[PDB]
Amino acid sequence: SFLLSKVSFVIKKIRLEKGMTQEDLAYKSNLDRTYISGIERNSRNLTIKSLELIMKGLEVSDVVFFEMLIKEILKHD
Amino acid sequence: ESFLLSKVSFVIKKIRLEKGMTQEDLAYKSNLDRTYISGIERNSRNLTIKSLELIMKGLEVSDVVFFEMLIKEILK
DNA sequence: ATGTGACTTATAGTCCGTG
DNA sequence: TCACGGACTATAAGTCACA
């Protein structure tokens, strides 16, 4: 899956920009630390609701997240 | 009771009706069961990103177009 | 046509760990 | 702190019999 690797790239990018650990993100997302790791390393198939939890844990608006996703989708060569 | 979910379901339906397609046509094109797509449009199915990809492919819409439409629906 | 409850099967997502 | 794995539970995927 093409889209999952882009979602998971954007998640890890924002997390690092915010200086958050995977545990910080797990805690603010109401998700397990190993699930955050799984998402980032293995581009796990998130639900819409868990994606929403994560964007909330990253403290980014949905719009900003989806604009970054679009950027990552349009990246080429 | 999810803000994002209600926006995603509204966009899938909006594009489906824009393409003049029935849920059954969408089922055919996405290889998903029509009663499964009904549940999504009715906001009663927390779909994964994989399922959303099959739906977007079924709608013959690019990810970028779908996301731009989702952004606009979020801003309304 | 679409909608829905009530399922079975597959997997999202949690919990217990390690080096 | 995080990659990685076993084993588990909660819930999504997928289906159908109605409505």
- Here the contacts of B1-4 (C-beta below 8 Å, separation 24 or greater) are B2/A48, B2/A49, B2/A52, B2/B46, B3/A52, B3/A62, B4/A48, B4/A49, B4/A51, B4/A52, B4/A55, B4/A62
Closest of A17, A3, A4 to residue A74, by C-alpha: A3
Nucleic strand D contacts from chain A, 11-70, CB < 7 Å: 21-23, 33-34, 37, 40-41, 47, 49
Q: What does the block give as tokens for A15? A: 């997390």
Q: Beta-carbon neighbour count of residue B2 at 10 Å?
A: 16
Contact A63 B71 (CB under 8 A): yes
Any idea what the CATH number is for the domain that residue A37 is in?
1.10.260.40
- Give the residue numbers spanning the domain of B2: 1-76
Report how many domains make up chain A: 1
Resolution in A: 2.1
Instruction: Scan residues 18-37 of A and list those with Cβ closer than 8 Å to B.
Output: none
Return the exposure string of A12-44: e unless at least 16 CB atoms fall within 10 Å of the residue's CB, then b.
bebbeeeebebebbbeebebeeebbeebbeebb
For chain B, say whether A48 makes contact (Cβ under 8 Å): yes
The C-alpha atoms of residue A7 and residue B7 are separated, in whole angstroms, by 18
Instruction: Give the method used.
Output: X-ray
Tell me how far apart the alpha carbons of residues B53 and B34 are, in angstroms, rounded to a whole number.
16
Q: B37, B27 in Cβ contact below 8 A?
A: yes
The residues, ordered by sequence, that sit 6+ positions from A55 with a Cβ below 8 Å of its Cβ are A61, A62, A65, B4
Using an 8 Å CB-CB cutoff, list chain B residues near A55.
4
Whose structure tokens read 């996405």?
Answer: B30
Give the CA diameter of chain A: 37
Q: How many CB atoms lie within 10 A of CB B72?
A: 12
Work out the burial of residue A49: count CB atoms within 10 Å of its CB; fewer than 13 is exposed, 13-18 middle, 19 or more buried.
middle
Which of B10, B55, B46 minimizes the C-alpha distance to B28? B55
The helix-helix angle for B49-58 and B23-30 (nearest 10°) equals: 110
Q: Is B46 on the interface with A (CB under 8 A)?
A: yes
Burial string for B16-49 (b: 16+ CB within 10 Å, else e) reads beeeebebebbbebbebeeeebeebbebebbbbb
